[PDB]
Design a protein around this ligand. Sequence first.
Ligand SMILES: CSCC[C@H](NC(C)=O)C(=O)O
Ligand SMILES: CSCC[C@H](NC(C)=O)C(=O)O
Ligand SMILES: CSCC[C@H](NC(C)=O)C(=O)O
Ligand SMILES: CSCC[C@H](NC(C)=O)C(=O)O
Ligand SMILES: [Mg+2]
Ligand SMILES: [Mg+2]
Ligand SMILES: [Mg+2]
Ligand SMILES: [Mg+2]
Lengths: 368, 368, 368, 368
Amino acid sequence: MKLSGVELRRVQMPLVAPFRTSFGTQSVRELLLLRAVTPAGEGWGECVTMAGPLYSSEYNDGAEHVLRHYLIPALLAAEDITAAKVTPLLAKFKGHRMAKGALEMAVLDAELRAHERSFAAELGSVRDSVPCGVSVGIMDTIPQLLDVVGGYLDEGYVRIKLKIEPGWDVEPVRAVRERFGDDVLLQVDANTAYTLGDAPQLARLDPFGLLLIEQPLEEEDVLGHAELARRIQTPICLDESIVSARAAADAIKLGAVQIVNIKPGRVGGYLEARRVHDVCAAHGIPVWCGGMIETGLGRAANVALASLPNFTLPGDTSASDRFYKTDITEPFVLSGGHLPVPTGPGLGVAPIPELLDEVTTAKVWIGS
Amino acid sequence: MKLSGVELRRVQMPLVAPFRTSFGTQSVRELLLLRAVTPAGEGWGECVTMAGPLYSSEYNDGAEHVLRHYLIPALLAAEDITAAKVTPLLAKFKGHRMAKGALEMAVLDAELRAHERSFAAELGSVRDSVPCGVSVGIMDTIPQLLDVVGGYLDEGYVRIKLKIEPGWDVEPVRAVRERFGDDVLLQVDANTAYTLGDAPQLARLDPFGLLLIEQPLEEEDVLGHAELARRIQTPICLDESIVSARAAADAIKLGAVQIVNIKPGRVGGYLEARRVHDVCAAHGIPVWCGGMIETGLGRAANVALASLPNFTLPGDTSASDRFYKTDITEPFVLSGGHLPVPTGPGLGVAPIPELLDEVTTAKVWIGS
Amino acid sequence: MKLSGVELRRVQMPLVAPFRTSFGTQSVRELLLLRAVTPAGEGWGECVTMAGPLYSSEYNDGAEHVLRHYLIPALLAAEDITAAKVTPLLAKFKGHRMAKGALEMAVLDAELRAHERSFAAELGSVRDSVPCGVSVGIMDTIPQLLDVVGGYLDEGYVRIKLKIEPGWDVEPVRAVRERFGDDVLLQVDANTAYTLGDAPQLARLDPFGLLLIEQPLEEEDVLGHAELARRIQTPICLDESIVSARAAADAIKLGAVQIVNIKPGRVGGYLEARRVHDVCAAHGIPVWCGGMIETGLGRAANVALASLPNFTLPGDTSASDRFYKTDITEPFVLSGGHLPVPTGPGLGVAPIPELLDEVTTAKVWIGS
Amino acid sequence: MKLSGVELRRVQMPLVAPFRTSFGTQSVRELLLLRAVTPAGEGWGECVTMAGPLYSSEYNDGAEHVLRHYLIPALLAAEDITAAKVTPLLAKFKGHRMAKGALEMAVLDAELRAHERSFAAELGSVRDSVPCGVSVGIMDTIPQLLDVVGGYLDEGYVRIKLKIEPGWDVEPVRAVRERFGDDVLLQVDANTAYTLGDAPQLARLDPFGLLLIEQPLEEEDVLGHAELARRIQTPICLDESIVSARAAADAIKLGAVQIVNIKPGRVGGYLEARRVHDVCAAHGIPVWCGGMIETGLGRAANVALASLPNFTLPGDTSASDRFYKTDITEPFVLSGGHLPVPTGPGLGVAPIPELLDEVTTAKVWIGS
Ligand SMILES: CSCC[C@H](NC(C)=O)C(=O)O
Ligand SMILES: CSCC[C@H](NC(C)=O)C(=O)O
Ligand SMILES: CSCC[C@H](NC(C)=O)C(=O)O
Ligand SMILES: CSCC[C@H](NC(C)=O)C(=O)O
Ligand SMILES: [Mg+2]
Ligand SMILES: [Mg+2]
Ligand SMILES: [Mg+2]
Ligand SMILES: [Mg+2]
């Protein structure tokens, strides 16, 4: 491969239903898409960044900037390009994992299509379909919340995940467990909302039989999680914290994590994500696929990933309709609480031009 | 893919020069080669077992049997096959890593060729050539040993590794450091010949500035290695003990190893081997490619693997001629202490039929 | 002694009722038998290997090959032979414990009968009988199980073992505890069937008061068990993982075991079995005899071992008729939950020829 | 068997040359012998206790007593008697290991002699000869010492042990290293003479390259030895502290010992001794036979013992003439630093009555 250039697209997609988290509400999804361009064909990449630096320090406009001025250029400059080589090529730039992962993807997509290979084959899928769960937002009311869960539960979702915030913890759970029963697959997500000093509160959930608690404390607070793990019964699961395989190895080493949520862009690439999977696996730590409310592009790479062997817990790989009415690709449709792993070269999906143009807000071409 | 069958060959290659280890003297190499047949095309796999069970429990005749009666059959009996599904497919059978790795190899090649991909591309190479060291056996005399060293040193080999054994330790090493200097890459390999009680004697090599000592103790003695490490200055490197990515992680966690020698057949396959690479890498453990006196087939696969990012040490990927006068494939030729990584699909190499047939002793077809 | 040769015999013995494990079901029992020939007399040995590598990497055909080609001949070669010297004579060959164990036994039996001493004598017995429990397969139904359990309880079986498997854990347990009570000697066996990631479900068994969980995880996952052991209540027991006294020690050392199932063949001989016993003892770890569905031959020397001092828990030494209608020896009959330790020299029992020949499929001589 | 009775003798052998320890000068050796009297044949036993309670609380007369009144009787009362059973039989009695040791020994001998078995055979010997070193007492002068040593060195002794005491440490060492060279197997023996507070002085030996320091501190000070092992280069050897297999296990687990000195009587028998060996082995702890200035009666058994596998270091099994001018059995002669392992049943040696009666100072029957 030889990099000809990339096309940076901004994309706005209205959410079907506002999505509330510890960091706020989301009614509309701005994304960043990349179209890799090589002499042979095209490759698409999606960036998980958001408008503002709320989940992380990375935001859309900042991603754009680095990609433009630093990353992309860097790659164009290179004689021979390999997805694998991207890393080494961009190594000199500290951070910007999400952005670097977006780029990698685009390239990899192209690389794979060129060899007629799906993301799944590369990654090492062992399945064809994958159990899906769903992430439910914070509510304003308990019934509003219960109705919703009942909603998703009916659709066939296999697991229920609750966004928590101090103020929306125990109760919400107390509620779902009560209503829906104890056999449901429930788990919660703080997105960093708590402090070690909130332990008791969190210990308040021990009773509820959760599978895990996701990132109760800040991203840098590994030890703290380790400590927290000590004071509570609900299993710790890290997200934000896991920005790499080595991070995972360290957190596991320290006892700060028992289950790992994998988010490909957070870790800087689907490639790195495979390693993380592999590392955890070696340590006996279970992984599951996380989600960034992506279009059908990332959704598709994620489904492929999620079919790896250590993903022994359902992922946030919901169907397309959970967030979008109209997906830029062929939508993802839940079939028996499952999604099928794409079969075509590369992602195994592509944007429906028409669709894409409808939701595009900007564009740009980065060529040498 | 769908497996059509596998041909089993028995090869018998003469050794340029007898090869002495802590387990015994070797003049002729007996191999087991596999040709996996698929709708798509053939694939080649090489098994590292040997005549007897001296390095491990695995031996040629045994691998053959297991292959023939359990493993091949089980794959044949699957609907879809992928190199990656081979593992789960053969998981019901305990052990036989070497045999498994051969088969996966054959599969993988055949699969890679189809997608017109190279082992190296698949594995994640970031290098186009690799530093090669040389494994120097046990000599009858020191002079003899010194000449040989001198010889290899001239061919341009980058590092020297000396087979050791009780009665062939500190001298042979003192002498080589003597002659050749302090600036040479020197390391040693006991092939499990020592005991913890021997620490004192091994402590004797402290002064020579070796890079590592390879498998001082028995295969199952990890804790011993962690202890042993506390007794010597020479860093520990494990070979026989690393039978998996999990083995690796365990040993690392226990402080039993500081550098890992990856051997694909020993760990059940190239795929597993990548995982080890990745695990180590995440724990800051350097790896380096092992060698089992393979033909160009296995040599090729190894060069590819050895071009991965964490192989920060010269491996035992010497030139073909180091062992064999006539290799059944294009020969591997040292260019400035390096060997070039193959570019073609799959192994990037294949057997020269007329050559292969010469060395072939037995063949069999394993189909449905 | 002086080894004159060995008679390999193949034996098929239909099961009294199909025996289902996490690794599959078993209606018949192929076995390997060895008749050790000395200028003085005969010796018998039994190999625990099965048809295929489902419990371990060892299998009947595999053991025969190694015995034939490597092991037996290595002993015949030796000038003077002691059961004790067997080890060091066969040391060059890696692994192959089950086989190595049978041979030893074969040898031992001869050597003893020659000193007019019983296995029990040599091993260091302290009892005259031993309490027997029984291994209870995986059933088709719960009732089916229950009958069976009850059935055994009445025969007089001292303790109950329940083979478990994901999908056959808690319930089958919940049942026996419920129906049969709380004062029954209950323990399970997951023949490696779980994963650390399954802890929670295994945690689900805390309440039943089981004596122990036998081998929840893979053979190689010792640190896993130690971790596991920190997540459940049910004490851990290892079988597969314990291949030697050294293995024992390490496990213990690591906090991955509290009770040890002793399987002489597994560990490579009755002699090593003794050693394990003593090692476990020294660490305050209780042991108990494991069974490998043996003939009266194996069953006899096991009853002998089961009589050592640290065997402080009922072993799997069920009466002959629990599996076999007709034994090649004089049956082992349960007299009030116990079995009598043999009194003759060597094993104490011999094959009832007429009975052998009736169930012997192959035969071979291995002389000079 | 059936114990018919025990004849207790007192013996008094005049040392060749006074032997000085950190506990006192020795001119004559006063032992306790035992004649097990069975229906079949008789057995010999030899107690390592000394005249007074100096090495340990046990002493000749205390021994007699307990034997006579407690021990002997216990066994006679028993219907069935096997050396193995002696231990359970004498359990109720707290301590007196040397005494139980001597007794067991007597029984064992008889038992073995009745199966026509050797001590060796039973214990599991693998060698036929053992490597002997010597125990060099505290001299009055340096030159004196040096002479002796060279004295012993010339006879063919393989390793040198130097008794030490505050004031007899470094110097004496400095002297033998100086004069005799560095490639001498040198080791010391403080017989409990130091304290943790003397670490610095003992650290003073670091330089000499000793194989070990035997029992630097008190019997009960395990943890102190572990601490000590932290403050010194010289590897810690325990003697007095090793009263059992368990104790070995524990001391090792705590890092208080790296080499273990085996004294059969000190541990309560030969059986136990074997176990300690086994234990140590399983933990990669080398062992070596310890001597208590014994006749050709203890000497024999030991020699057998010393032929076990884990006896990786030269024992204190000096030739008969190192202490005694005229042994009560066939003397033991150094053959190239070695001492042949006795081939006859039981100890393989007996006391020459003429010789015996000469040294005996008393006698006594103990029957029913
Ligand atoms: C843009 S919010 C990201 C946080 C995310 N929630 C979901 C359901 O996508 C998670 O932690 O899995
Ligand atoms: C059965 S040989 C195994 C030892 C091998 N060296 C070479 C190149 O032979 C290695 O230890 O890397
Ligand atoms: C043939 S599988 C053997 C496993 C054995 N059970 C019995 C009852 O023999 C055990 O407890 O592991
Ligand atoms: C009176 S000897 C006691 C201590 C003893 N020395 C010898 C030579 O027997 C030893 O440490 O083995
Ligand atoms: Mg999250
Ligand atoms: Mg090696
Ligand atoms: Mg079991
Ligand atoms: Mg001493």
